[PDB]
Amino acid sequence: SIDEQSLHNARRLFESGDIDRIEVGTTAGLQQIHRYLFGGLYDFAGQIREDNISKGGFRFANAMYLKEALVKIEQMPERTFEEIIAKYVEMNIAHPFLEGNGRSTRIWLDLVLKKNLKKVVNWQNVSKTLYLQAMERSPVNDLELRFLLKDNLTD
Amino acid sequence: SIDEQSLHNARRLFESGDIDRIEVGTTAGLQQIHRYLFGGLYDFAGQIREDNISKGGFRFANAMYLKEALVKIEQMPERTFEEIIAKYVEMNIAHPFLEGNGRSTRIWLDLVLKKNLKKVVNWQNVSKTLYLQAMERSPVNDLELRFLLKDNLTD
Amino acid sequence: SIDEQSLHNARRLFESGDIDRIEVGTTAGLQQIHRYLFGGLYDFAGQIREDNISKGGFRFANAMYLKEALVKIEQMPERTFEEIIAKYVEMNIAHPFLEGNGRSTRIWLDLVLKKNLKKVVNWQNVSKTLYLQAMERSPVNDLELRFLLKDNLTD
Amino acid sequence: SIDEQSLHNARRLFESGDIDRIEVGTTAGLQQIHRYLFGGLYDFAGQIREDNISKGGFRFANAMYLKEALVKIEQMPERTFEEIIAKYVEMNIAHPFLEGNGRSTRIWLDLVLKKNLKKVVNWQNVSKTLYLQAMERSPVNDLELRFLLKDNLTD
Ligand SMILES: Nc1ncnc2c1ncn2[C@@H]1O[C@H](COP(=O)(O)OP(=O)(O)NP(=O)(O)O)[C@@H](O)[C@H]1O
Ligand SMILES: Nc1ncnc2c1ncn2[C@@H]1O[C@H](COP(=O)(O)OP(=O)(O)NP(=O)(O)O)[C@@H](O)[C@H]1O
Ligand SMILES: Nc1ncnc2c1ncn2[C@@H]1O[C@H](COP(=O)(O)OP(=O)(O)NP(=O)(O)O)[C@@H](O)[C@H]1O
Ligand SMILES: Nc1ncnc2c1ncn2[C@@H]1O[C@H](COP(=O)(O)OP(=O)(O)NP(=O)(O)O)[C@@H](O)[C@H]1O
């Protein structure tokens, strides 16, 4: 119910035109997206977490310095695909919500790609298995992720 | 060459009593230890890194917010073995030097244990292989590290 | 869809009494469980994989020597809780199917615990988050898994 | 002491021309290299391990089926760079010795590349940091390793 309802909310975000009101490339913009997707579903919708979380051997940015990290991440440049991917990779490492980081930050990435490069990711053609592998590796080396995503951009 | 002299430098730190002048439980204190062990050996002795580093697939705190991270980590409480281990785990994730984090931060840990618990680690009885495993796991769960060290304390 | 239907099959395995005919602690027994759960749902139901697979940075036993590995794994002893967990850990590393290893092998584990200790895991009280973490760690050290499961055995 | 003495033996393996007498692409050939490097230094020189080992959170092939694994791995083809790297990656996962797998298996790799492609790796121009990263990743995805090594091939 939660994930189907948030998918409907994501659809609403685009169909409504409310997507055009989201700040691009900023922490606030990511919060806007998360609040939109999960509002009325998670009580923490749009809110930066205060608890620590991990997945698959990686511990995401410690909540005690997550806000400081986000301030630095949102200032990263967006001039090229490689810069945009690097910025996305650091926002994923920040992982600022208890849940729904993936969906919200992928929308956030698409807005950055669209603003700067006039392209978005064609997610329907991206393997979820290969995407997860590439994201898991990305804090160490974003090569796999860049190869995967660059092949799946659409203008 | 470097490791041999730095081991001599660590013995001098203790045997001279210079160890008693090290600030306990702080970033500055860790820098003091690192400067003492590696002064004249690494030109970055005592200095917070500006480059990014990883080991075993784990990305240590990004250099862009590392200084900010350290300000927070050093304020962590030190009242119990579990608190002190948690603080140590976070200082390891920070990994604030290019090299020599292990040796420096273990001395740092012992000073915190000594101050607050009147105990230090009996490293003589700790397997390096098992210690490395526990440290690698610690960001996700410090159970292995607590299991390894707690009954290896000595007063 | 597949998950809801396989769950129904797993309930039927127990409710029908068919569970009592499953060979305990063997590769063939694991295959019997997988075929029952996934027959008609995955065309590879019950079948040892010929493709390589990975999760979270760990590559499961190479398909080229998987059958050989399974021959050794099923011979492992089941004399104590700790031996049984060790055997379960090796069967998870083998990871013999393309999908459904988790559900099938947890049933397989319970049959081994029941046969040798007259216990099963009370999975209802086991955190999925902590279980996944413990499984991810288990190839290196099964301490987390033993801590988790021993606290959740039932008669 | 052992690392320096083994380097000298490695030096001699090439200086003497004995490298030309080593069996190429086989388990026996790898054991020959390991014995040349470490015979008289490690008591287990040239011997397939009977103990389990791991590094960086990765469990190498279980000793109970390591021999069976090696029988399969040595049969892997060697016709393309990609096949040769895949074979090397599997021999590293097998990790057949207690110690000295890296040095011995890199020599083994060069012999297979030399035989089949008339090239070897120019290890002088390969970053040890990037190499270890690429090795750690290789069981999941050998792209990093292939990217790192292919443009460092020489004759
Ligand atoms: N080990 C890891 N290291 C770094 N990033 C990871 C790791 N595991 C998962 N990720 C990323 O974290 C995301 C999942 O975060 P989560 O907060 O569960 O988002 P979600 O929207 O609920 N699920 P999803 O749609 O699967 O992304 C994945 O899509 C990956 O981008
Ligand atoms: N994958 C990992 N994840 C988290 N921590 C790690 C990892 N690998 C190593 N460590 C920790 O990092 C330390 C090594 O950092 P490093 O900067 O190499 O210190 P060192 O003093 O040069 N070597 P050592 O004496 O082996 O600790 C180890 O002792 C562990 O505490
Ligand atoms: N990185 C890892 N290393 C070792 N084991 C893992 C890892 N990730 C997951 N596992 C185990 O693999 C199982 C999942 O295997 P899979 O074939 O997807 O089974 P499933 O029944 O489809 N899913 P689940 O019900 O979630 O177990 C998990 O339940 C864990 O036991
Ligand atoms: N986490 C890992 N996963 C896969 N392979 C690894 C991992 N860590 C290290 N390796 C590989 O194992 C080798 C080290 O094996 P080891 O038996 O220590 O050999 P060594 O010759 O003693 N050391 P080195 O000269 O550094 O390779 C490295 O060179 C890597 O190829």
Ligand SMILES: [Mg+2]
């Ligand atoms: Mg999620």
Ligand SMILES: [Mg+2]
């Ligand atoms: Mg070091």
Ligand SMILES: [Mg+2]
């Ligand atoms: Mg699954």
Ligand SMILES: [Mg+2]
């Ligand atoms: Mg070694």
